[PDB]
Design a protein around this ligand. Structure first.
Ligand SMILES: [Mg+2]
Ligand SMILES: [Mg+2]
Ligand SMILES: [Mg+2]
Ligand SMILES: [Mg+2]
Ligand SMILES: [Mg+2]
Ligand code: NA
Lengths: 220, 119, 148, 178, 48
RNA sequence: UCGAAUCGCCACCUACAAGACUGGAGCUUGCUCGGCGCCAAGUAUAUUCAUGAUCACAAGACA
RNA sequence: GAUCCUUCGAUGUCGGCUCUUCCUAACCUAGCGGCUAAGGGUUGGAUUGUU
RNA sequence: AGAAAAAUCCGUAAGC
RNA sequence: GGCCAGAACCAGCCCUUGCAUUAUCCUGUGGGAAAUCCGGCGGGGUGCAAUGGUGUUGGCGA
RNA sequence: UUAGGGAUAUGUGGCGUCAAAACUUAUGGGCUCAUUCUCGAUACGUGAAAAGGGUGUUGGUGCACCGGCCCCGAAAAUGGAUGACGCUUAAGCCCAAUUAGUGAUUGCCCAUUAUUCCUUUGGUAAGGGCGAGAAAGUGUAGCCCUUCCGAUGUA
């Protein structure tokens, strides 16, 4: 929430609304560790990144193996005062953020700035839905990283079985969002077809040598 | 999907002979094949890995059989060959040609806008 | 590493099999049976005119070969179930009440079990009727384990 | 890739002396990385069999043997390796390559992978190309059938090195970063 | 680290053959301070 | 106060799923039949640019 | 037992009382056909400075 | 400078 | 102001096919249609060499 | 193996992030799935034996044995350690390459080391001289100029 001084400065200056350059990554069907390493290096290089759909990351192996690994992690606590001990976060976005934090140099101001440059969500929230197209990391995708015969696990199911009470909430919100987007995209089909037809028809009216150059370069 | 078989036409993906078309003349093993093409000067008989080929939809069944099949003409006619030639054209281009392409695209966009408004 | 391994089956007239994305749907006189096979990575093919069903494995070790036979057996059981169906019999003082979809047992040597919708249970000595073998066998095994 | 070994022929002799005015001349075939290793293997074999040390010997010639035209053939490689608690072991395997050097390099990689055997413990007895009707194993016999064909699945095809990207648009070929 | 040499990554340059093209070029690093000090054309062009 | 670093934008991207998967058929089961944007509102007939004097934060902006 | 590495301008020594925590090769309690299981329990007195 | 916000009225990313 | 920058030139330094061997080889003319393979006859790709100077153009400095 | 500083190239060790280097290289071959200390994974050095089994192979022949990887055998006291995260179409293990069957030569990263350039200091030192400049000289603000070699260190 902005302060009244910040609002007054903005009003007095009169400049228009500003948004910095932010990359939004759709993390569905990505390998957790490879995605974390790539994102950590980009954060250190100076990018602002927002990751969505953190509950559909992938890990290799069976859910039972990965759940046993998490329980072993959860067993560690400072015996003398557990309120100081390690804090075990159960949500998939917190799991991703902790993996990245362990891949960063966290006890330095530079590493702290890098870690604060990252935002993580489950699903796609309304303040992110309409900001532009999402990206993928092609060198960290499951269909090219795992052999197809081997089993794998989805982060949401494992996190649900170790804690994380909000799986059903996220599922309902995602279903509603996809329904709304599907309705909107079913609309505008006529407009898209009209623009495609206009593009096809303009060739008959533009100059012939321009058409020839387009055909030569393959934009025909 | 297109199968790997004797006489099948393939395109090379990477390497010094990339974006070239040849014919499979012998299956050495699960990973390697022998490729030749009399038409191309650089495509004499050699060994290629199967990670470096893309099968096409033509299979002759050597120079006489290839000429009779006329798969080279069909490949020249399809849209992939057009894309490859356009990529080579874009690669070898000058500032003047880039300017000409820019004005052609701007002309097409303007006329598309006019047609859309008219309709 | 064998290049190609094959297994094929014939389809009786009046029954149809459709495959799409490793999803199998067998339609017969009795009804439709759906099976899931996304955890297999096989090559399923159907030719209606020849009334043949085949499954292929390319460059496979012993395990894929072992999985091919089970796939064929499952498809065969599916077609048999949609063609004629299954009817299991159980017979054992003990008073067992068929009721409707609830099985109650009392005075053994009260145990209650819920019967799934797809299976229709009746008392002649009870009779289990289902369109697929797995559900009927599961119901019989559940009843046996309860009465033990 | 091209094979990492070469086919050499070393011809040698013992230096003539008064007790031995006309010594015997021997011919040796070896697959080696370079001709220094070829000569070393030659003198090891000569000492181990004929009781002739390198310090009283002569090397008459060493040359590299050329290979035949590129044709897919079946090769029989007769090989022997050493490992402790097993003694010397001799095995015969059939490969499928385009040259003798390729078949022997395949054999070396196979022995290293399956038995942890290394170059200085392996010895090659014979290599030859056999006709297609003398193959006794199905895994090699299946490649000379008349109707052999298969599709390419699970292809992890990458991009040209100059076009690789770090972030790309979700359903598009547009690079966002790189 | 040795501070007298710096490493720079340029967009769309992803090969050693590409990075060879840029040898000899000039790089800037713009920033800002807290007070107005002298610049190149201080007297002529006081708009700088 | 305040001058500052940042230098693509869009009611055509900003919906979705699968890679043993990709338009429709046939049986012969492997064969056959993003858009714009880069100096005339648009590819032609036009029109002001200095002396800011040979590099210097772009002396310019928030399309 | 062996040893002699630290400490001789000093690191307070047996038993009991009091109080907390951890282990398992499971005495009881709990499931199986000897196996699993460390979750909760495991007493009060005569003689003796005792263990 | 980054919202698990929004995109005559009210009610419908519709007809409204 | 040799205070700060740019370009140019000298010197030095760093980088950037030949001839040998070509044969277990190449090429025509019983076995497994053809090919892979084995005997008869005829024709022929790897070791060396090829910081220092000497002015010029701007900025700041009245 | 060590005077005060530049540039170039290496040794041991490495090239997913921490952390410089394959923005996760290859147009190389095989093997491996590991459910509560436990799949592996930098020697010296800090994790194990007899016996028994799964997946890929090898002698023998008309079934027996005999090796690669993995599992069982394998039980302790604060919560914890391939360094951490993580990795399985490896970022694991055994071999092999250098931009790949296209045709001569070195993929790249990091030292108080090597080569080279500038400056100091000392010699079992070696030569020359006697418009501002020169002293017949062990040692200075060194009489002046050129040249080569060494330079760490407790008692
Ligand atoms: Mg003692
Ligand atoms: Mg030392
Ligand atoms: Mg790095
Ligand atoms: Mg000294
Ligand atoms: Mg002293
Ligand atoms: Na390490």
């Amino acid at each position: 929430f902005p302060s009244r001084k910040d609002a007054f400065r903005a009003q007095r200056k009169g400049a228009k609304k500003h948004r910095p350059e932010i990359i939004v990554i759709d993390l569905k069907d990505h390998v957790l560790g490879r995605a974390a390493a790539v994102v950590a290096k980009q954060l250190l290089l100076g990018k602002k990144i927002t990751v969505v759909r953190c509950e559909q990351l992938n890990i290799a192996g069976t859910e039972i193996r990965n759940k046993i690994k998490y329980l072993q992690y959860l067993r560690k606590r400072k015996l003398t005062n557990p309120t100081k001990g390690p804090f075990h976060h159960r949500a998939p976005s917190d799991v991703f953020v902790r993996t990245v934090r362990s891949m960063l140099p966290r006890y330095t101001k530079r590493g702290m700035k890098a870690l604060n440059s990252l935002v993580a969500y489950e699903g796609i929230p309304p303040n992110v839905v309409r900001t532009g197209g999402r990206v993928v990391i092609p060198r960290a995708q499951r269909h090219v990283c795992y052999r197809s015969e081997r089993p794998y696990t989805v982060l949401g199911n494992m996190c649900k079985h170790v804690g994380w009470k909000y799986s059903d909430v996220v599922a309902n919100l995602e279903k509603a969002r996809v329904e709304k987007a599907s309705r909107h995209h079913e609309k505008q089909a006529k407009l898209r077809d009209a623009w495609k037809s206009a593009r096809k028809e303009a060739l008959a009216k533009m100059p012939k040598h321009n058409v020839e150059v387009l055909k030569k370069f393959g934009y025909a | 999907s297109h199968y790997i078989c004797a006489g099948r036409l393939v395109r090379i993906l990477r390497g010094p002979r990339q974006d070239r078309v040849g014919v499979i003349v012998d299956i050495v093993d699960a990973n390697r094949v022998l490729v030749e093409n009399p038409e191309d000067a650089k495509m004499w008989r050699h060994v290629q890995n199967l990670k470096n080929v893309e099968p096409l939809k033509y299979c002759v069944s050597l120079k006489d059989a290839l000429a009779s099949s006329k798969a080279l003409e069909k490949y020249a006619k399809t849209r992939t060959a057009a894309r490859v030639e356009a990529k080579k054209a874009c690669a070898v281009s000058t500032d003047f040609e880039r300017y000409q392409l820019r004005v052609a695209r701007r002309s097409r966009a303007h006329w598309a806008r006019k047609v859309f408004d008219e309709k | 590493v064998k290049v190609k391994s094959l297994c094929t089956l014939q389809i009786p007239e009046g029954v149809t099999v459709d495959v799409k994305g490793r999803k199998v749907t067998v339609t017969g006189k009795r009804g439709t049976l759906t099976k899931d096979l996304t955890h297999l990575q096989l090559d399923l093919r159907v030719d209606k005119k020849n009334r043949t069903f085949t499954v292929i494995r390319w460059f496979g070790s012993k395990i894929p070969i072992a999985c091919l036979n089970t796939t064929k057996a499952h498809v065969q059981n599916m077609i048999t179930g949609v063609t004629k169906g299954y009817r299991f019999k159980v017979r054992c003082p003990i008073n067992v009440s068929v009721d409707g979809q609830n099985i109650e047992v009392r005075n053994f040597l009260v145990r209650r079990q819920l019967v799934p919708n797809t299976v229709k249970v009746s008392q002649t000595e009870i009779v289990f009727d289902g369109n697929d073998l797995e559900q009927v066998s599961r119901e019989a095994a559940v009843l046996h384990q309860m009465c033990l | 890739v091209k094979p990492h070994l070469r086919h050499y022929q070393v011809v040698g002799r013992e230096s003539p002396s008064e007790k031995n005015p006309e010594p015997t001349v021997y011919k040796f075939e070896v697959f080696a990385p370079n001709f220094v290793v070829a000569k070393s293997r030659f003198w090891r074999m000569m000492r181990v069999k004929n009781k002739v040390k390198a310090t009283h010997g002569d090397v008459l010639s060493c040359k590299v043997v050329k290979d035949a035209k590129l044709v897919a053939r079946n090769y029989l490689v007769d090989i022997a390796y050493y490992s402790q608690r097993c003694g010397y072991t001799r095995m015969v395997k059939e490969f499928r390559d385009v040259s003798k050097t390729g078949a022997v390099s395949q054999a070396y990689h196979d022995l290293a992978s399956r038995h942890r055997a290394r170059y200085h413990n392996i010895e090659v007895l014979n290599v030859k190309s056999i006709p297609d009707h003398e193959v006794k194993h199905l895994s090699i016999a299946q490649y000379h059938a008349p109707n052999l064909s298969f599709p390419l699945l699970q292809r992890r095809t990458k991009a040209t090195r100059k076009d690789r990207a770090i972030f790309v648009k979700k359903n598009t070929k547009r690079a966002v970063v790189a | 680290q040795t501070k007298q040499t710096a490493l720079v990554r340029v967009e769309n340059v992803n090969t050693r053959e590409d990075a060879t093209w840029y040898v000899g070029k000039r790089v800037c690093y713009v920033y800002h301070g807290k007070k107005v000090k002298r610049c190149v054309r201080w007297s002529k062009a006081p708009a700088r």
